[PDB]
Amino acid sequence: LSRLDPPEAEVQIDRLITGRLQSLQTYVTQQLIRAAEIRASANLAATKM
Amino acid sequence: VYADSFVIRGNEVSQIAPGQTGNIADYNYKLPDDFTGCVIAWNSNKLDS
């Protein structure tokens, strides 16, 4: 926002936002998978308890 | 529909675009970043010279 011009730097900001959104979505997916695994392990541990 | 009119140089018409910089694009006539429409220009040496 200091080097390039506003109208032509909008595509760069859009691409950065898309990349960060994808990098956060894959992290959310990994967290969901690990949370399901932890839930299964906790159910097994409660059954054993 | 809104129509604006002005007279500028030949190569100076390149500054007539959304978000440009220059003596005209910043101090005489600035277009918004989300501008939509058409820009029409032609020679006027037969009348304005």
DSSP string for chain A: --SS-HHHHHHHHHHHHHHHHHHHHHHHHHHHHHHHHHHHHHHHHHHH-
Block residue for tokens 């009119």: B5
Whether A7 sits inside 8 A of B21 (CB atoms) is: no
Looking at residue B6, its amino acid is: F
Q: Name the structure determination technique.
A: cryo-EM
Chain B contact probe: residue of A5, A11, A13, A14 with most B CBs at under 10 A: A5
Pick the residue from chain B with its C-alpha nearest to A6.
B19
Rounded distance between C-alpha atoms, residue A29 and residue B38, angstroms: 45
Total residue count of chain A as it appears in this document: 49
Cβ atoms within 10 A of the Cβ of B25, count?
19
Write the CA distances from B43 to A39, B6, B8, B40, integer angstroms: 74, 13, 10, 11
Candidates B34, B13, B10; CA nearest to B24 is B13
Dig out the tokens for B41 from the structure. Answer: 């220009």
